[PDB]
Design a protein around this ligand. Structure first.
Ligand SMILES: CC[C@H](NC(=O)c1ccc(OCc2ccccn2)c(C(F)(F)F)c1Cl)C(=O)C(N)=O
Length: 213
């Protein structure tokens, strides 16, 4: 009925992505970080710069997809830690060094499109899932408290990557616990509670995936 992975050690502190369109990269390492806690008990910050700089299927600071980062981490035979490959908030030449590898992955799985009960099962059974939402409405961006629900939110306008780190219910309203990449000043300490079982509100279950480890 309720899980919150922040209290379980599956979630690293809230990051600020800056003036680079790298939410996909942050969502991607968050999912990876969760599977490393589950698989090995330890986790550390993995490297979003590594992904922006080296995932050429993507547009670097100009945008990208999580599954693509997951494919890269597999074909590359790893991703560096943050400590090895720090975040500069802009693209440069790929400078992946194998000596700083901190995660590998065996592929990924995608949540069946639109299926919120499948996303709850994934979140319960796997852990933090990378998700895509419509994050363009002004009401999203100025969120501070409660459970977000805006019927103008468009499931056919997926534009931003976040990371589902739990689910539950606040004063009667069913929600997802969502982790953003806009600083611990955004939202409620960097997090947003989004509407759950309110018809795939904002597209939350439309392009969701996790890495295999
Ligand atoms: C550039 C800003 C950036 N968004 C993306 O990198 C991005 C762009 C398009 C997009 O999806 C476009 C799409 C999805 C499905 C069908 C057709 N088109 C997706 C996502 F969420 F769906 F995975 C993301 Cl992350 C992000 O929000 C930020 N850094 O702040």
């Amino acid at each position: 009925d309720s899980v919150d992975y922040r209290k379980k050690g599956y979630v690293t502190p809230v990051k600020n992505q800056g003036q680079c369109g790298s939410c996909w990269a942050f969502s991607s390492v968050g999912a990876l970080e969760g599977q490393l806690k589950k698989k090995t008990g330890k986790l550390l910050n993995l490297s979003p710069q590594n992904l922006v700089d080296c995932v050429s299927e993507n547009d670097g600071c100009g945008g990208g997809y999580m599954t693509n980062a997951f494919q890269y981490v597999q074909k590359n035979r790893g991703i560096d830690s943050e400590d090895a490959y720090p975040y500069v908030g802009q693209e440069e030449s790929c400078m992946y060094n194998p000596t700083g590898k901190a995660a590998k992955c065996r592929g990924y799985r995608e949540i069946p499109e639109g299926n919120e009960k499948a996303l709850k099962r994934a979140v319960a059974r796997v852990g933090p899932v990378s998700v895509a939402i419509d994050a363009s409405l002004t009401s999203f961006q100025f969120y501070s408290k409660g459970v977000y629900y805006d019927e103008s939110c468009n499931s056919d306008n997926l534009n931003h990557a976040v990371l589902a780190v739990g689910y539950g219910i606040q004063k009667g309203n069913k929600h997802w616990i969502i982790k953003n990449s806009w600083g611990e000043n955004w939202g409620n300490k960097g997090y947003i509670l989004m509407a759950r079982n309110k018809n795939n509100a904002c597209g939350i279950a439309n392009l969701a995936s996790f890495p295999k480890m």
